[PDB]
UniProtKB/Swiss-Prot annotation:
Annotated compartments: Membrane raft
Role of this protein: The production of the second messenger molecules diacylglycerol (DAG) and inositol 1,4,5-trisphosphate (IP3) is mediated by activated phosphatidylinositol-specific phospholipase C enzymes. It is a crucial enzyme in transmembrane signaling.
Record's disease association: Familial cold autoinflammatory syndrome 3: An autosomal dominant immune disorder characterized by the development of cutaneous urticaria, erythema, and pruritis in response to cold exposure. Affected individuals have variable additional immunologic defects, including antibody deficiency, decreased numbers of B-cells, defective B-cells, increased susceptibility to infection, and increased risk of autoimmune disorders.
Quaternary structure note: Part of a complex composed of EEIG1, TNFRSF11A/RANK, PLCG2, GAB2, TEC and BTK; complex formation increases in the presence of TNFSF11/RANKL. Interacts (via SH2 domain) with CSF1R (tyrosine phosphorylated). Interacts constitutively with THEMIS2.
Protein name: 1-phosphatidylinositol 4,5-bisphosphate phosphodiesterase gamma-2
Origin species: Homo sapiens (Human)
Residues of the full protein shown: 471 to 913 of 1265
Consequence when changing residue 49 to F: Found in patients with chronic lymphocytic leukemia; uncertain significance; results in resistance to ibrutinib therapy
Post-translation changes: Phosphorylated on tyrosine residues by CSF1R. Phosphorylated on tyrosine residues by BTK and SYK; upon ligand-induced activation of a variety of growth factor receptors and immune system receptors. Phosphorylation leads to increased phospholipase activity.
Length: 117
C-alpha cells in the first residue's frame, strides 16, 4: 500500500543574521520549496512587509549534501549548493532522524534526482 501527497510542514535554516536556528514554514509545491518568515521567532525591528513566501528554491539548480556532525550546535545538517553560477549556499537542520530523512530525501528527490526525457 502506498499513497502520494504533498510534503508540507516546518523546517530550520541557518540564520547568520542572529547566528541561530529559527522556525520556518516550509512547503514543497510541484518541484520547488517555499519557506516563510519566522512564525514565532520574528525579529521584526520595525515590522516590515513580511509576506508569506520569503524565499523559494527552484530545486532545478542546486545540490544536496549531508553535512556530518551537523553545523552550528547541530548534529544533522544538509547544505544546498546552487548550480546557476555564483549563488550562495543554504544550510538546513532538524530535531529528529525521521524529519531529517523525510524532508531532506524530498529535497533530493527533486535536486539529487532529475528525470527528463
Amino acid at each position: 500500500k502506498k499513497d502520494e501527497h504533498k510534503q508540507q510542514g516546518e523546517l530550520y535554516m541557518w540564520d547568520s543574521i542572529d547566528q541561530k536556528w529559527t522556525r520556518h514554514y516550509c512547503a514543497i509545491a510541484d518541484a520547488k520549496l517555499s519557506f516563510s518568515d519566522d512564525i514565532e521567532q520574528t525579529m521584526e525591528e520595525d515590522n516590515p512587509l513580511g509576506s508569506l513566501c520569503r524565499g523559494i528554491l527552484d530545486l532545478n539548480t542546486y545540490n544536496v549534501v549531508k553535512a556530518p556532525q551537523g553545523k552550528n550546535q547541530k548534529s544533522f545538517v544538509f547544505i544546498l549548493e546552487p548550480k546557476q553560477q555564483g549563488d550562495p549556499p543554504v544550510e538546513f537542520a532538524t530535531d529528529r532522524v525521521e524529519e531529517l530523512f523525510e524532508w531532506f530525501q524530498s529535497i533530493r528527490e527533486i535536486t539529487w534526482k532529475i528525470d527528463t526525457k
